[PDB]
């Protein structure tokens, strides 16, 4: 995993999402600070779709990788309008950039 490539890949997420210490969500999507290991659809102050609002899943690396590859294959009714990252390197790299160690 190359977190440097990951930061570049992440530019596709950064208009919808925020990712900072402020707790404030992005223009269209939740703050991704603290994502790794977080319960799905739980960060306060963001109105999730019913699928994510009602989920008991956790954003493990394995669950995040599946979701980034094809969001509606994991949560069909999601409001995330994103086709998915089909390149395995780009998924692993952006996950690496999104890790707590980053
Ligand atoms: C706008 C067009 C988006 C782009 C581009 C990306 N995401 Fe997104 N994401 C978006 C919305 C509107 C939502 C909420 C969905 C719902 O059904 O309520 C999300 C949600 C996520 C989550 C779940 C967060 C949680 O706290 O459970 C994750 C992990 C996520 N998005 C990641 C992500 C990444 C890594 C992206 C770039 C590759 C990305 N999103 C793009 C809107 C949009």
Author numbering: 3 to 104
Q: What is the paper's account of this structure, in its own sentences?
A:
We were able to solve the structure of CycN at 1.9 Å, and the structure has a similar overall fold as bovine cytochrome c. We used rigid-body docking between CycN and Pnao and NicA2 and LHNO via the ZDOCK server to gain insight into how CycN may interact with these proteins. The ZDOCK server returns the top 10 docking poses as an output, and for Pnao, all 10 docking poses had CycN positioned in the same spot on the surface of Pnao. Docking CycN with the structure of NicA2 produced similar results, with eight of the top 10 docking poses having CycN positioned at the same relative location as that seen in the Pnao docking poses. Interestingly, this was not observed when we performed docking of CycN with LHNO; in that case, CycN was distributed across several positions on the surface of LHNO, with only one of the top 10 docking poses showing CycN at the common region observed with NicA2 and Pnao. This observation is consistent with the fact that LHNO reacts poorly with CycN and suggests that this common docking position observed with NicA2 and Pnao may correspond to the true CycN binding site for these enzymes. For example, Pnao contains Ser91, Phe98, Ser100, and Tyr422 on the surface of this potential binding site, and NicA2 contains identical residues at these positions. We previously observed that NicA2 and nicotine were unable to reduce bovine cytochrome c and noted that bovine cytochrome c has a much more positively charged surface than CycN on the heme-containing side of the protein. Yeast cytochrome c also has a similarly positively charged surface, and this difference in surface charge between CycN and bovine and yeast cytochrome c may, in part, be responsible for Pnao and NicA2’s specificity for CycN as a cytochrome c-based electron acceptor. Given how buried FAD is in the structure of Pnao, we suspect that CycN binds on the surface of Pnao, and the electrons on Pnao’s flavin are transferred to CycN over longer distances.
The first two steps in the pathway are catalyzed by the enzymes nicotine oxidoreductase (NicA2) and pseudooxynicotine amine oxidase (Pnao), which convert nicotine into pseudooxynicotine (Pon) and Pon into 3-succinoylsemialdehyde-pyridine, respectively. Both NicA2 and Pnao are members of the widespread flavin-dependent amine oxidase enzyme family. Enzymes of this family use a flavin adenine dinucleotide (FAD) prosthetic group to accept a hydride from their amine containing substrate, forming an oxidized product and reduced flavin hydroquinone (FADH2) in the reductive half reaction. However, our lab recently demonstrated that NicA2 is instead a dehydrogenase that uses a cytochrome c protein (called CycN) as a biological oxidant.
